Design a protein around this ligand. Structure first.
Ligand SMILES: CC(=O)C[C@@H](c1ccccc1)c1c(O)c2ccccc2oc1=O
Length: 380
């Protein structure tokens, strides 16, 4: 019956009393929620002055009853079924190599308003870590790619440019010797100028040799490493998936060319092995990156407490291009004694957009959120 209260837009009040390493603070948020579209719109203000932690670390703590459950999943919506009596949501949030938040909140209807009242205690944070030191990005669209990605892409670029220089000197001068041409046993310019050194050897078979796509592999390389470095500076999803696909094609071509270098050409190419290692590293970084941009809350039932349990990882962007992991363990227990929906295993998909209000001089955070339930299973 609790679902009836969520057709339409519902006003939202959030109140948090917090203590992090002895620094006491309070947050109040106000807004509205539209469960039909899984849309939350809220504004949060630190009422005690300045927040002692970065705002992104409080997003998960600061109303999953506003998630959109598709029709075929209606009976797996524990959060709405607990209303109006509400539920207790308790969490432990472990920041990797740093402190811990412990939160207890009551989410319930007071009059017409959905109210989330939170108590938060943070402990064991280091004063110059990413949290207390405020080293996390807020909502930057252009940011750092990290010195690992910069090193990989710049090295790959230098190697591609060098291979271009070698090809442009050998085709000009037959007797030219590159640095990676050592004696008569080791030769890189012989590898570059083979049929596989252009279009990976397979563009001439499919598009013909006349094609503009039948370029030297180092052209694909300059474009690839420049593209990887550029997309590493972005924070959206399309940059991430594009990164994954491009690094996957790059990995396939690199494995093929590695099979050609040995076993077929039987040559020693030092720049080639270097590039292979680069492309493996960028493959790993891209796979990891796709893992890191997905906020998915994994929900299972708890029949002992007649509630639910949830596990998920959140990764906050650090200003230097690295990531800060925050492990989330969650449990929800109904406040009343009426019946609730004990769901099958599923997950919630969440997209958050943080912003600033130019007419708010208090330390604050404007939050827009879209949450939809998915991945329903009868299993586990
Ligand atoms: C290292 C280079 O600059 C060119 C290298 C390469 C490696 C990965 C992806 C594209 C290009 C390269 C070789 O491995 C290679 C190996 C066997 C036969 C031809 C080759 O030519 C290359 O372009």
């Amino acid at each position: 019956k609790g679902e009836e209260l969520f057709t339409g837009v519902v006003p939202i009040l959030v109140e948090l009393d917090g203590d992090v390493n002895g620094h006491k603070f309070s947050v109040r948020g106000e807004g509205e929620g539209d469960a039909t579209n899984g849309k939350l719109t809220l504004k949060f203000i630190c009422t005690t002055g300045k927040l002692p932690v970065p705002w992104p670390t409080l997003v998960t703590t600061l109303v999953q009853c506003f998630s959109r459950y598709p029709d075929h999943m209606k009976r797996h919506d524990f959060f709405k079924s607990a209303m109006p009596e509400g539920y207790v949501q308790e969490r432990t949030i472990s920041f990797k190599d740093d402190g811990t938040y412990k939160t207890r909140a009551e989410v319930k209807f007071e009059g017409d308003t959905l109210v989330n009242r939170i108590e938060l205690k943070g402990i064991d944070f280091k004063e110059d870590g990413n949290i207390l030191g405020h080293k996390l990005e807020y909502n930057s669209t252009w940011g750092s790619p990290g010195w690992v990605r910069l090193a990989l892409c710049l090295t790959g670029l230098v190697l591609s440019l060098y291979a271009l220089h070698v090809k442009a000197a050998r085709a000009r001068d037959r007797d030219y010797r590159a640095l990676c041409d050592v004696g008569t046993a080791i030769s890189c310019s012989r590898v570059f100028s083979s049929r596989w050194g252009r279009g990976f050897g397979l563009v001439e078979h499919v598009l013909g040799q006349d094609s503009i796509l039948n370029q030297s592999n180092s052209i694909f390389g300059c474009i690839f490493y420049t593209l990887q470095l550029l997309l590493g500076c972005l924070r959206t999803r399309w940059a991430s998936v594009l990164m994954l696909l491009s690094s996957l094609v790059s990995l396939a071509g690199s494995v093929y060319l590695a099979w050609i270098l040995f076993f077929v050409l039987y040559d020693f190419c030092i720049v080639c092995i270097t590039t292979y290692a680069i492309n493996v590293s960028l493959m790993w970084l891209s796979f990891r990156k796709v893992q890191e941009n997905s906020h998915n809350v994994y929900i299972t039932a708890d029949k002992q407490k007649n509630g639910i349990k949830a596990n998920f990882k959140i990764r906050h962007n650090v200003e230097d291009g690295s990531v800060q992991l925050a492990d989330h363990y969650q449990q929800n227990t109904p406040i009343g004694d009426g019946p609730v929906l004990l769901p099958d295993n599923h997950y919630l998909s969440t997209q958050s957009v943080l912003s600033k209000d130019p007419n708010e001089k208090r330390d604050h955070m404007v939050l827009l959120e879209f949450v939809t339930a998915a991945g329903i299973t009868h299993h586990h």
